[PDB]
Design a protein around this nucleic acid. Sequence first.
RNA 1: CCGAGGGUAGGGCCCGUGACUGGGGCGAAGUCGUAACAAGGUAGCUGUACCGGAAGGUGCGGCUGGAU
RNA 2: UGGGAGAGGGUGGUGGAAUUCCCGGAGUAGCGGUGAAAUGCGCAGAUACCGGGAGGAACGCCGAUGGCGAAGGCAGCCACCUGGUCCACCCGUGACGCUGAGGCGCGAAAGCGUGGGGAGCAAACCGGAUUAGAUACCCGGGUAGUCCACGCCCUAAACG
RNA 3: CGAUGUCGGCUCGUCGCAUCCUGGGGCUGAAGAAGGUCCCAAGGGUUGGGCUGUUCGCCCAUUAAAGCGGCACGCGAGCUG
RNA 4: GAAUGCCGGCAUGAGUAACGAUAAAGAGGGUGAGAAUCCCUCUCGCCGUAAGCCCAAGGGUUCCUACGCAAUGGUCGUCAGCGUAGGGUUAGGCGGGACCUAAGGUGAAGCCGAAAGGCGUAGCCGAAGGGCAGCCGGUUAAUAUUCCGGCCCUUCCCGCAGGUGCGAUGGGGGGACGCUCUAGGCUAGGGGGACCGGAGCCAUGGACGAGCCCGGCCAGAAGCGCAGGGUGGGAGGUAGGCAAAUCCGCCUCCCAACAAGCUCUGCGUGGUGGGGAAGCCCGGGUGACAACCCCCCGAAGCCAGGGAGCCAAGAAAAGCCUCUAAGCACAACCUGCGGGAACCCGUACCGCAAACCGACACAGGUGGGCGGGUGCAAGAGCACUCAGGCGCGCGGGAGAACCCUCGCCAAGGAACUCUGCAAGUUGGCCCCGUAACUUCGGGAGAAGGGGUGCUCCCUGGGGUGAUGAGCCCCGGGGAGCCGCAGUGAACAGGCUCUGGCGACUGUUUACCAAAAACACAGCUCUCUGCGAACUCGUAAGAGGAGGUAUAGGGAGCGACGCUUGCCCGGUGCCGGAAGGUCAAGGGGAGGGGUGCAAGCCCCGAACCGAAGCCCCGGUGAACGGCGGCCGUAACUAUAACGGUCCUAAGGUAGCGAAAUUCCUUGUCGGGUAAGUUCCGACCUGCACGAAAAGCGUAACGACCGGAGCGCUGUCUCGGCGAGGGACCCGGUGAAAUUGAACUGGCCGUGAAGAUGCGGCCUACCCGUGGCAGGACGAAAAGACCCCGUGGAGCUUUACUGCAGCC
RNA 5: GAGCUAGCCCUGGCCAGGGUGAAGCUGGGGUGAGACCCAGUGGAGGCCCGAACCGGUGGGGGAUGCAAACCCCUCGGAUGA
Lengths: 48, 275
Amino acid sequence: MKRTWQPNRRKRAKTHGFRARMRTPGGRKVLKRRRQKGRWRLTPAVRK
Amino acid sequence: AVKKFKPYTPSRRFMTVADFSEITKTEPEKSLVKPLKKTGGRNNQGRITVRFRGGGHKRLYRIIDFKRWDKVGIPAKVAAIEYDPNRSARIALLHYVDGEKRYIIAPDGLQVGQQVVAGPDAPIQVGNALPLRFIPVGTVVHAVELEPKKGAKLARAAGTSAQIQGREGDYVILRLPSGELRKVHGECYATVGAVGNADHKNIVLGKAGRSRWLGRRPHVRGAAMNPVDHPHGGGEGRAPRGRPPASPWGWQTKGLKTRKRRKPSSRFIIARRKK
RNA sequence: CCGAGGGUAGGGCCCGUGACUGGGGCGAAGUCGUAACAAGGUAGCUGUACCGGAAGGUGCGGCUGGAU
RNA sequence: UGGGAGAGGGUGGUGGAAUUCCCGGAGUAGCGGUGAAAUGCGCAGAUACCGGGAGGAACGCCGAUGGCGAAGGCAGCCACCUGGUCCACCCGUGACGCUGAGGCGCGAAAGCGUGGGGAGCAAACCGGAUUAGAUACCCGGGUAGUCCACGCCCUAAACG
RNA sequence: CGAUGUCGGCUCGUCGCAUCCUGGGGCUGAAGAAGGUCCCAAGGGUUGGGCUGUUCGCCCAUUAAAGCGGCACGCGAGCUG
RNA sequence: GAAUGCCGGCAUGAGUAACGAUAAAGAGGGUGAGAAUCCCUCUCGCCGUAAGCCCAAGGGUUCCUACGCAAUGGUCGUCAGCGUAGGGUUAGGCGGGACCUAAGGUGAAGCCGAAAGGCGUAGCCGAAGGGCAGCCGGUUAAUAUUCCGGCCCUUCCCGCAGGUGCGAUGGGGGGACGCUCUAGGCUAGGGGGACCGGAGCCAUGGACGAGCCCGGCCAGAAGCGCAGGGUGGGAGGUAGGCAAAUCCGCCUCCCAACAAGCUCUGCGUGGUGGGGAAGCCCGGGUGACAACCCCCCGAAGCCAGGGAGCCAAGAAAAGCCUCUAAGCACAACCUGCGGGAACCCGUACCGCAAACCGACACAGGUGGGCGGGUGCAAGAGCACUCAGGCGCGCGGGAGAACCCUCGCCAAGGAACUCUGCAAGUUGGCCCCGUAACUUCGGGAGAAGGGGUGCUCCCUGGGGUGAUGAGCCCCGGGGAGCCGCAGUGAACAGGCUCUGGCGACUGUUUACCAAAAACACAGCUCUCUGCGAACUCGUAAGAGGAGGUAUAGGGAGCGACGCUUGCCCGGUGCCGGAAGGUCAAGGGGAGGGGUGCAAGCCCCGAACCGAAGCCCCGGUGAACGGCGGCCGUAACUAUAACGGUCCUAAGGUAGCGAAAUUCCUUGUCGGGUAAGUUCCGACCUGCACGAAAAGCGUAACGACCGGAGCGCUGUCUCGGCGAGGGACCCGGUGAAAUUGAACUGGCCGUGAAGAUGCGGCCUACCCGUGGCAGGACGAAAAGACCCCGUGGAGCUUUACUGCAGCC
RNA sequence: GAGCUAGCCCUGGCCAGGGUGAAGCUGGGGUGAGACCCAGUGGAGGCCCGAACCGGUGGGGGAUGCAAACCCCUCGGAUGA
Ligand SMILES: O=C(N[C@H](CO)[C@H](O)c1ccc([N+](=O)[O-])cc1)C(Cl)Cl
Ligand SMILES: [Mg+2]
Ligand SMILES: [Mg+2]
Ligand SMILES: [Mg+2]
Ligand SMILES: [Mg+2]
Ligand SMILES: [Mg+2]
Ligand SMILES: [Mg+2]
Ligand SMILES: [Mg+2]
Ligand SMILES: [Mg+2]
Ligand SMILES: [Mg+2]
Ligand SMILES: [Mg+2]
Ligand SMILES: [Mg+2]
Ligand SMILES: [Mg+2]
Ligand SMILES: [Mg+2]
Ligand SMILES: [Mg+2]
Ligand SMILES: [Mg+2]
Ligand SMILES: [Mg+2]
Ligand SMILES: [Mg+2]
Ligand SMILES: [Mg+2]
Ligand SMILES: [Mg+2]
Ligand SMILES: [Mg+2]
Ligand SMILES: [Mg+2]
Ligand SMILES: [Mg+2]
Ligand SMILES: [Mg+2]
Ligand SMILES: [Mg+2]
Ligand SMILES: [Mg+2]
Ligand SMILES: [Mg+2]
Ligand SMILES: [Mg+2]
Ligand SMILES: [Mg+2]
Ligand SMILES: [Mg+2]
Ligand SMILES: [Mg+2]
Ligand SMILES: [Mg+2]
Ligand SMILES: [Mg+2]
Ligand SMILES: [Mg+2]
Ligand SMILES: [Mg+2]
Ligand SMILES: [Mg+2]
Ligand SMILES: [Mg+2]
Ligand SMILES: [Mg+2]
Ligand SMILES: [Mg+2]
Ligand SMILES: [Mg+2]
Ligand SMILES: [Mg+2]
Ligand SMILES: [Mg+2]
Ligand SMILES: [Mg+2]
Ligand SMILES: [Mg+2]
Ligand SMILES: [Mg+2]
Ligand SMILES: [Mg+2]
Ligand SMILES: [Mg+2]
Ligand SMILES: [Mg+2]
Ligand SMILES: [Mg+2]
Ligand SMILES: [Mg+2]
Ligand SMILES: [Mg+2]
Ligand SMILES: [Mg+2]
Ligand SMILES: [Mg+2]
Ligand SMILES: [Mg+2]
Ligand SMILES: [Mg+2]
Ligand SMILES: [Mg+2]
Ligand SMILES: [Mg+2]
Ligand SMILES: [Mg+2]
Ligand SMILES: [Mg+2]
Ligand SMILES: [Mg+2]
Ligand SMILES: [Mg+2]
Ligand SMILES: [Mg+2]
Ligand SMILES: [Mg+2]
Ligand SMILES: [Mg+2]
Ligand SMILES: [Mg+2]
Ligand SMILES: [Mg+2]
Ligand SMILES: [Mg+2]
Ligand SMILES: [Mg+2]
Ligand SMILES: [Mg+2]
Ligand SMILES: [Mg+2]
Ligand SMILES: [Mg+2]
Ligand SMILES: [Mg+2]
Ligand SMILES: [Mg+2]
Ligand SMILES: [Mg+2]
Ligand SMILES: [Mg+2]
Ligand SMILES: [Mg+2]
Ligand SMILES: [Mg+2]
Ligand SMILES: [Mg+2]
Ligand SMILES: [Mg+2]
Ligand SMILES: [Mg+2]
Ligand SMILES: [Mg+2]
Ligand SMILES: [Mg+2]
Ligand SMILES: [Mg+2]
Ligand SMILES: [Mg+2]
Ligand SMILES: [Mg+2]
Ligand SMILES: [Mg+2]
Ligand SMILES: [Mg+2]
Ligand SMILES: [Mg+2]
Ligand SMILES: [Mg+2]
Ligand SMILES: [Mg+2]
Ligand SMILES: [Mg+2]
Ligand SMILES: [Mg+2]
Ligand SMILES: [Mg+2]
Ligand SMILES: [Mg+2]
Ligand SMILES: [Mg+2]
Ligand SMILES: [Mg+2]
Ligand SMILES: [Mg+2]
Ligand SMILES: [Mg+2]
Ligand SMILES: [Mg+2]
Ligand SMILES: [Mg+2]
Ligand SMILES: [Mg+2]
Ligand SMILES: [Mg+2]
Ligand SMILES: [Mg+2]
Ligand SMILES: [Mg+2]
Ligand SMILES: [Mg+2]
Ligand SMILES: [Mg+2]
Ligand SMILES: [Mg+2]
Ligand SMILES: [Mg+2]
Ligand SMILES: [Mg+2]
Ligand SMILES: [Mg+2]
Ligand SMILES: [Mg+2]
Ligand SMILES: [Mg+2]
Ligand SMILES: [Mg+2]
Ligand SMILES: [Mg+2]
Ligand SMILES: [Mg+2]
Ligand SMILES: [Mg+2]
Ligand SMILES: [Mg+2]
Ligand SMILES: [Mg+2]
Ligand SMILES: [Mg+2]
Ligand SMILES: [Mg+2]
Ligand SMILES: [Mg+2]
Ligand SMILES: [Mg+2]
Ligand SMILES: [Mg+2]
Ligand SMILES: [Mg+2]
Ligand SMILES: [Mg+2]
Ligand SMILES: [Mg+2]
Ligand SMILES: [Mg+2]
Ligand SMILES: [Mg+2]
Ligand SMILES: [Mg+2]
Ligand SMILES: [Mg+2]
Ligand SMILES: [Mg+2]
Ligand SMILES: [Mg+2]
Ligand SMILES: [Mg+2]
Ligand SMILES: [Mg+2]
Ligand SMILES: [Mg+2]
Ligand SMILES: [Mg+2]
Ligand SMILES: [Mg+2]
Ligand SMILES: [Mg+2]
Ligand SMILES: [Mg+2]
Ligand SMILES: [Mg+2]
Ligand SMILES: [Mg+2]
Ligand SMILES: [Mg+2]
Ligand SMILES: [Mg+2]
Ligand SMILES: [Mg+2]
Ligand SMILES: [Mg+2]
Ligand SMILES: [Mg+2]
Ligand SMILES: [Mg+2]
Ligand SMILES: [Mg+2]
Ligand SMILES: [Mg+2]
Ligand SMILES: [Mg+2]
Ligand SMILES: [Mg+2]
Ligand SMILES: [Mg+2]
Ligand SMILES: [Mg+2]
Ligand SMILES: [Mg+2]
Ligand SMILES: [Mg+2]
Ligand SMILES: [Mg+2]
Ligand SMILES: [Mg+2]
Ligand SMILES: [Mg+2]
Ligand SMILES: [Mg+2]
Ligand SMILES: [Mg+2]
Ligand SMILES: [Mg+2]
Ligand SMILES: [Mg+2]
Ligand SMILES: [Mg+2]
Ligand SMILES: [Mg+2]
Ligand SMILES: [Mg+2]
Ligand SMILES: [Mg+2]
Ligand SMILES: [Mg+2]
Ligand SMILES: [Mg+2]
Ligand SMILES: [Mg+2]
Ligand SMILES: [Mg+2]
Ligand SMILES: [Mg+2]
Ligand SMILES: [Mg+2]
Ligand SMILES: [Mg+2]
Ligand SMILES: [Mg+2]
Ligand SMILES: [Mg+2]
Ligand SMILES: [Mg+2]
Ligand SMILES: [Mg+2]
Ligand SMILES: [Mg+2]
Ligand SMILES: [Mg+2]
Ligand SMILES: [Mg+2]
Ligand SMILES: [Mg+2]
Ligand SMILES: [Mg+2]
Ligand SMILES: [Mg+2]
Ligand SMILES: [Mg+2]
Ligand SMILES: [Mg+2]
Ligand SMILES: [Mg+2]
Ligand SMILES: [Mg+2]
Ligand SMILES: [Mg+2]
Ligand SMILES: [Mg+2]
Ligand SMILES: [Mg+2]
Ligand SMILES: [Mg+2]
Ligand SMILES: [Mg+2]
Ligand SMILES: [Mg+2]
Ligand SMILES: [Mg+2]
Ligand SMILES: [Mg+2]
Ligand SMILES: [Mg+2]
Ligand SMILES: [Mg+2]
Ligand SMILES: [Mg+2]
Ligand SMILES: [Mg+2]
Ligand SMILES: [Mg+2]
Ligand SMILES: [Mg+2]
Ligand SMILES: [Mg+2]
Ligand SMILES: [Mg+2]
Ligand SMILES: [Mg+2]
Ligand SMILES: [Mg+2]
Ligand SMILES: [Mg+2]
Ligand SMILES: [Mg+2]
Ligand SMILES: [Mg+2]
Ligand SMILES: [Mg+2]
Ligand SMILES: [Mg+2]
Ligand SMILES: [Mg+2]
Ligand SMILES: [Mg+2]
Ligand SMILES: [Mg+2]
Ligand SMILES: [Mg+2]
Ligand SMILES: [Mg+2]
Ligand SMILES: [Mg+2]
Ligand SMILES: [Mg+2]
Ligand SMILES: [Mg+2]
Ligand SMILES: [Mg+2]
Ligand SMILES: [Mg+2]
Ligand SMILES: [Mg+2]
Ligand SMILES: [Mg+2]
Ligand SMILES: [Mg+2]
Ligand SMILES: [Mg+2]
Ligand SMILES: [Mg+2]
Ligand SMILES: [Mg+2]
Ligand SMILES: [Mg+2]
Ligand SMILES: [Mg+2]
Ligand SMILES: [Mg+2]
Ligand SMILES: [Mg+2]
Ligand SMILES: [Mg+2]
Ligand SMILES: [Mg+2]
Ligand SMILES: [Mg+2]
Ligand SMILES: [Mg+2]
Ligand SMILES: [Mg+2]
Ligand SMILES: [Mg+2]
Ligand SMILES: [Mg+2]
Ligand SMILES: [Mg+2]
Ligand SMILES: [Mg+2]
Ligand SMILES: [Mg+2]
Ligand SMILES: [Mg+2]
Ligand SMILES: [Mg+2]
Ligand SMILES: [Mg+2]
Ligand SMILES: [Mg+2]
Ligand SMILES: [Mg+2]
Ligand SMILES: [Mg+2]
Ligand SMILES: [Mg+2]
Ligand SMILES: [Mg+2]
Ligand SMILES: [Mg+2]
Ligand SMILES: [Mg+2]
Ligand SMILES: [Mg+2]
Ligand SMILES: [Mg+2]
Ligand SMILES: [Mg+2]
Ligand SMILES: [Mg+2]
Ligand SMILES: [Mg+2]
Ligand SMILES: [Mg+2]
Ligand SMILES: [Mg+2]
Ligand SMILES: [Mg+2]
Ligand SMILES: [Mg+2]
Ligand SMILES: [Mg+2]
């Protein structure tokens, strides 16, 4: 049946993407935390 | 002259439609239409603030002339009478001798090819707009401004009208469509006649699908819900109200008045509606 | 081929009968009231409507086949 | 052909008297109601009185033992549309007449549908009183209805 | 109670005997036939339907008879629901 | 040494289940160390509105070639979507961007909020919508509307020539729109040809034939032809289109009007450029100078912005055309022609799936286009087949039980069972015929019956064409033939009677309930005069609504029919400028602390003083409520009638053992051989009852009862047969569970149900296929139940607050 | 976090074939005029049958599954809420 993951590149980029995070107090804290933790990717990769 | 149908489906048995007899032009004036942005009942927050709205037929908004003191003394010809889906009244397309074109609400009895005019000395004739002070007592009017130059506010739906009862200083006394007696300032414009399409109220929608066409989504009784949802929610089996009948938000809904007490316009209302 | 009739299926008219039910007729001396006949003690009657244990009452209009 | 009388019918206007309610003024201890009362209303200011307003329904006098219509029925006043009818003259048609099973239309009230309207009145209903009772008669309230439009109903002591 | 699945049915039996029938008896208010009552006896047998979820019970048509109980009210790692 | 402890390792179950659709395989020949599994050929089977082909998303080298097989592949592997390496994606015209706007998002102005932030007009962003210029063929191992070839086209820049008041982000036009139905003409696609081209074939009884078999086109600029779309021309006036305007709008006049002209598409033709089969021979060659023609069918596509009808009344903006404004008229714009200029990103491959979403090469899920032929009335249905694609990545045997899916069955025919559950039956089309009831539509495919193939003969009308022929479509009558059987296979209602509930089509507990529940048109009450009420928000601001009482919110009821009674004492709500109570505040009689005093400071009575509450009324489709006892009739019985107590008032019409009735399988009647169910009645209704509506109701229902007919493996009562498993052999090889075990029966005992204790009995050691009585078998720290001064949802006249409102 | 699901907003797309035959319109009849009747035309509808598509009624199978909701048979809707 129809499962929950239905990939959509524009959806992915517009929702979790770098510019979405920077636009918002909480999203910037996301970027700030993932930098402090040393994440290699701060944001989900998507082909665009 | 509401039209019936033979019972050739279960729903056609009761359905009635308007006869559309007065309509003479079945496509709108292109320079006068705008896109009418549906809300679904949602506000600028995305939140439903009026329940059970959405899903109706697409409509274009037809701009209407609710001022008419815009063109004092300039007569116009009634070019056509048209269907307007944003309102129960029909609308009349006016060709001013100016060349300008405008829509008004089409009063009852208004004929295509006749002339209307607005102003302090327009004839007292169906379709003409004057300040209220210059309209003789006893006259039936519609599209009544409520305050000078603010736009027609009262008696705009199909069949409705207000009557001029008397005068008092700068104000006239109207009996509104609801039967309330109210003082409206004499410089407020109004239009001789009653609104047309008085048969409108006799239309029998006929089936649930018809309400859906109009953008009306199914209304859920509170008694049909659970207590997380409504004062009337819950109970094993059916249940009477078991408390004073109430809205989803808990306020009482059989009798409880709701007009604000200290509202400044109270000085201008003579008799609240009756019946 | 037609054909007495037999069979299958579905209709129409009539008769009989049926738990129970409706009112009708009748029946020397039952129970309740007293509507009508006198102005019958609220003139009667009337078509209709609503109501009432019951006769009946009341509303609307009509008739005199009503009195003084 | 020339005239006549008439609440004959339909539409639309519009006139005053009265009732009710509302507003203002003035005024105080009751008013109302009956056979007598009581319910009811009234010092939160009624009744009685004056001025204003709103709304519905019915048209006093004239009015009659009257008039009109086929009947049911029709009553302020005005205009318009319209029917029946009578008289004069003796002009025209030339028996073209009578009645009429069916059919069709009309048909008081009450009632029914859908809108409207609602002052007065008032089935139902409530209360007061009377009474052995009083699902009545009398009194205080009062909803349909009574009014308008369209559509039904088609009854009668629709009787001379 | 860190789980012993709980009515009825179906299937499959097996046991007790306070025995429904069949076999053997004594008493009889046992003429005969047919019963009643008690004793001995558990080898075998103990039907098909209507109603109800029903167990049970009533009813129909039969029968030699249409027995009563136990087995976690036998049997859901066998079925049904 | 234990914590259903933690991490890791390794056992048991076990050579056990399984190896993922029952579309299916066999053989020969290659290769290789090794082959059921890789390659080739022949035979067989499966899909074919796909299981084929082309797009979009998503995926991201999986593409092609060489080398290779440790692991991955459910077996094998020489093979592969795997390992290593090399190669491969080419655009002014395809798609997106340098164009437009949609919701929405963002947001100079501006508004709001402790902060973070929230809004917000214009503007900007935003597409699978608008707009915009490329078709056919060839080529590569792998890209192609991209390279090549042929024939077309767009914009930008510059110049030449001609023409014109040129000029815009501003005005106007246009762009520009629904649903259903639909005309004419075409194209796509398809069928046939006794015509044209073709390698060949004659078999096994016959055929050298009007035989068989294969193919018979595609793209094309200008011009031309056919079919369509779009559009009146002139003149005068002019105050409107937020400046101007010759434009547009409005008024008038003349003329034109189912046309025509102009304009723009579609289709046809068209210089020219391509393609071109079977077969035969090693993707290629040949066929081949290939032929490329006629007839018919024919779109849902095209002409298109076409026509008609209808109500629920159907985007925007740019491109484009026109108007003028500053300006400029040595400019500029328009037309034609010529030269130059033309950027960025995508392009491989998978794409109903082994490459996407489901942990897997997973029987699931995934939007658009094409989707051939024949027959069956039609069709995208069904059967078979084309092109193309597959046989589903373990096999080989055997022919037990048992399971699954399937076929048949003597006599019976629901006796099965909670229930005809399940499975039979029926089954398409044509014709005949069809009841109660009804809201007149319906019920209706009611029911029930008849026909159905093939052959010859006669004949009716329509399309194309020509009026005929041919092809094609709908028939009509007569005579025959065969079989058990003619919708001969596949696809395709069993019917009826009668109740309950709900009017109806719809909706729902994703994944145990599809219903009588929700919704529904419709009815009523109620609030709301507009900066409405109400809702979301602290606010600003939104929705309501660019609506205005024939409208909007809330509530109940639930099509329709006939109806909806009595109670306002309590609660609610509505009305009530009196009266009672009433907080802050006003007021300050009169006290007190202190100070030598002036003073400073404190307490404080009457009285004035809102809402609310009290109080007086109203109000039921507001919350709600609608009695008890005793007596009485000339047979008995029962009480129309009476007495009395209480109430705010004592349940009306209608209905009633009911989806409600406890006693209960009430009683009587019907149906049955028999009926706790069903239906009709009665009424002592435990405990119906009138918008939490009452009683009905045609039609409707995968709802729930009861009955009958038809027919059956449901059953008496089972039997046989088929295939997939189970079983055996080769390959690969799990699981929960598990204190250890050398793990029998009885009768007892024991914490009360013992393989493990006692006494007896029985018993050689170890497996394999089976069955499930036990191991109080497994699974899940019982959901029930209780306990915890544990938690959470929900309610209210529990307590106490808060929003909101007064 | 609304790439699942629920509602709404914007913009597109999809629904083989067959059946029934409303209004209107035309004509005929009818009448003083009418209503109205009949035939033809017409093509309405939360109309009917049935694929795609959307569902999920009953039963069976599956139950360490092909699958953490699947499979087979059967069944509802299919121009509309
Ligand atoms: O809870 C169950 N049964 C328990 C066993 O732990 C017990 O046997 C039981 C069964 C039935 C019962 N009853 O009918 O009341 C009570 C307890 C089973 Cl349903 Cl899992
Ligand atoms: Mg889903
Ligand atoms: Mg995307
Ligand atoms: Mg996307
Ligand atoms: Mg997205
Ligand atoms: Mg976002
Ligand atoms: Mg982003
Ligand atoms: Mg911050
Ligand atoms: Mg910050
Ligand atoms: Mg990481
Ligand atoms: Mg790094
Ligand atoms: Mg991140
Ligand atoms: Mg109708
Ligand atoms: Mg009708
Ligand atoms: Mg109209
Ligand atoms: Mg526009
Ligand atoms: Mg809006
Ligand atoms: Mg917004
Ligand atoms: Mg936001
Ligand atoms: Mg709301
Ligand atoms: Mg809404
Ligand atoms: Mg309108
Ligand atoms: Mg409106
Ligand atoms: Mg005013
Ligand atoms: Mg209405
Ligand atoms: Mg609408
Ligand atoms: Mg509604
Ligand atoms: Mg509702
Ligand atoms: Mg509920
Ligand atoms: Mg509920
Ligand atoms: Mg919630
Ligand atoms: Mg709560
Ligand atoms: Mg609550
Ligand atoms: Mg409740
Ligand atoms: Mg409830
Ligand atoms: Mg209840
Ligand atoms: Mg409930
Ligand atoms: Mg209650
Ligand atoms: Mg309440
Ligand atoms: Mg409020
Ligand atoms: Mg009012
Ligand atoms: Mg015989
Ligand atoms: Mg009398
Ligand atoms: Mg008397
Ligand atoms: Mg009398
Ligand atoms: Mg009375
Ligand atoms: Mg007094
Ligand atoms: Mg006083
Ligand atoms: Mg009035
Ligand atoms: Mg004469
Ligand atoms: Mg009357
Ligand atoms: Mg009384
Ligand atoms: Mg007395
Ligand atoms: Mg009244
Ligand atoms: Mg009458
Ligand atoms: Mg326990
Ligand atoms: Mg355990
Ligand atoms: Mg356990
Ligand atoms: Mg013996
Ligand atoms: Mg004897
Ligand atoms: Mg003895
Ligand atoms: Mg024995
Ligand atoms: Mg029994
Ligand atoms: Mg028992
Ligand atoms: Mg019993
Ligand atoms: Mg015997
Ligand atoms: Mg026993
Ligand atoms: Mg016991
Ligand atoms: Mg017991
Ligand atoms: Mg047991
Ligand atoms: Mg058991
Ligand atoms: Mg079980
Ligand atoms: Mg059991
Ligand atoms: Mg067990
Ligand atoms: Mg067990
Ligand atoms: Mg220890
Ligand atoms: Mg341990
Ligand atoms: Mg632990
Ligand atoms: Mg561990
Ligand atoms: Mg380790
Ligand atoms: Mg481990
Ligand atoms: Mg290990
Ligand atoms: Mg082992
Ligand atoms: Mg084993
Ligand atoms: Mg296994
Ligand atoms: Mg497996
Ligand atoms: Mg299959
Ligand atoms: Mg199979
Ligand atoms: Mg072979
Ligand atoms: Mg091999
Ligand atoms: Mg090998
Ligand atoms: Mg082989
Ligand atoms: Mg091969
Ligand atoms: Mg095919
Ligand atoms: Mg991937
Ligand atoms: Mg390998
Ligand atoms: Mg290997
Ligand atoms: Mg290696
Ligand atoms: Mg492997
Ligand atoms: Mg695998
Ligand atoms: Mg090798
Ligand atoms: Mg490549
Ligand atoms: Mg190119
Ligand atoms: Mg550039
Ligand atoms: Mg833009
Ligand atoms: Mg600012
Ligand atoms: Mg900010
Ligand atoms: Mg954006
Ligand atoms: Mg953009
Ligand atoms: Mg685009
Ligand atoms: Mg392009
Ligand atoms: Mg081209
Ligand atoms: Mg190519
Ligand atoms: Mg337009
Ligand atoms: Mg438009
Ligand atoms: Mg569009
Ligand atoms: Mg429409
Ligand atoms: Mg056509
Ligand atoms: Mg072509
Ligand atoms: Mg064809
Ligand atoms: Mg061509
Ligand atoms: Mg001008
Ligand atoms: Mg050659
Ligand atoms: Mg299509
Ligand atoms: Mg088109
Ligand atoms: Mg816009
Ligand atoms: Mg110059
Ligand atoms: Mg020019
Ligand atoms: Mg650039
Ligand atoms: Mg490519
Ligand atoms: Mg592909
Ligand atoms: Mg598929
Ligand atoms: Mg696809
Ligand atoms: Mg693949
Ligand atoms: Mg993969
Ligand atoms: Mg997942
Ligand atoms: Mg596989
Ligand atoms: Mg798959
Ligand atoms: Mg073909
Ligand atoms: Mg067919
Ligand atoms: Mg296979
Ligand atoms: Mg397959
Ligand atoms: Mg074997
Ligand atoms: Mg067979
Ligand atoms: Mg056979
Ligand atoms: Mg048989
Ligand atoms: Mg039978
Ligand atoms: Mg039989
Ligand atoms: Mg049976
Ligand atoms: Mg049995
Ligand atoms: Mg059942
Ligand atoms: Mg049954
Ligand atoms: Mg069958
Ligand atoms: Mg069939
Ligand atoms: Mg019948
Ligand atoms: Mg019939
Ligand atoms: Mg019947
Ligand atoms: Mg019936
Ligand atoms: Mg009928
Ligand atoms: Mg038939
Ligand atoms: Mg025949
Ligand atoms: Mg044959
Ligand atoms: Mg069928
Ligand atoms: Mg229903
Ligand atoms: Mg329901
Ligand atoms: Mg009902
Ligand atoms: Mg109903
Ligand atoms: Mg309903
Ligand atoms: Mg439907
Ligand atoms: Mg659930
Ligand atoms: Mg569910
Ligand atoms: Mg679930
Ligand atoms: Mg289920
Ligand atoms: Mg349920
Ligand atoms: Mg259903
Ligand atoms: Mg529901
Ligand atoms: Mg309903
Ligand atoms: Mg109703
Ligand atoms: Mg109403
Ligand atoms: Mg707020
Ligand atoms: Mg707005
Ligand atoms: Mg409303
Ligand atoms: Mg509303
Ligand atoms: Mg409902
Ligand atoms: Mg009826
Ligand atoms: Mg009360
Ligand atoms: Mg009261
Ligand atoms: Mg009260
Ligand atoms: Mg106060
Ligand atoms: Mg109560
Ligand atoms: Mg009460
Ligand atoms: Mg006596
Ligand atoms: Mg009554
Ligand atoms: Mg009863
Ligand atoms: Mg009942
Ligand atoms: Mg019930
Ligand atoms: Mg009850
Ligand atoms: Mg009972
Ligand atoms: Mg019982
Ligand atoms: Mg019985
Ligand atoms: Mg009987
Ligand atoms: Mg009884
Ligand atoms: Mg209630
Ligand atoms: Mg009923
Ligand atoms: Mg019914
Ligand atoms: Mg019915
Ligand atoms: Mg249904
Ligand atoms: Mg159903
Ligand atoms: Mg039965
Ligand atoms: Mg039968
Ligand atoms: Mg069997
Ligand atoms: Mg077999
Ligand atoms: Mg062996
Ligand atoms: Mg092995
Ligand atoms: Mg392996
Ligand atoms: Mg041990
Ligand atoms: Mg040991
Ligand atoms: Mg052992
Ligand atoms: Mg042993
Ligand atoms: Mg013990
Ligand atoms: Mg023991
Ligand atoms: Mg032992
Ligand atoms: Mg030992
Ligand atoms: Mg010992
Ligand atoms: Mg021992
Ligand atoms: Mg021992
Ligand atoms: Mg032993
Ligand atoms: Mg073995
Ligand atoms: Mg074994
Ligand atoms: Mg066992
Ligand atoms: Mg067992
Ligand atoms: Mg066990
Ligand atoms: Mg245990
Ligand atoms: Mg056990
Ligand atoms: Mg478990
Ligand atoms: Mg625990
Ligand atoms: Mg526990
Ligand atoms: Mg637990
Ligand atoms: Mg307990
Ligand atoms: Mg405590
Ligand atoms: Mg404690
Ligand atoms: Mg606690
Ligand atoms: Mg809590
Ligand atoms: Mg979503
Ligand atoms: Mg998605
Ligand atoms: Mg469809
Ligand atoms: Mg169709
Ligand atoms: Mg037919
Ligand atoms: Mg027809
Ligand atoms: Mg027409
Ligand atoms: Mg339909
Ligand atoms: Mg049909
Ligand atoms: Mg589904
Ligand atoms: Mg299913
Ligand atoms: Mg079945
Ligand atoms: Mg499962
Ligand atoms: Mg399935
Ligand atoms: Mg199926
Ligand atoms: Mg269907
Ligand atoms: Mg269809």
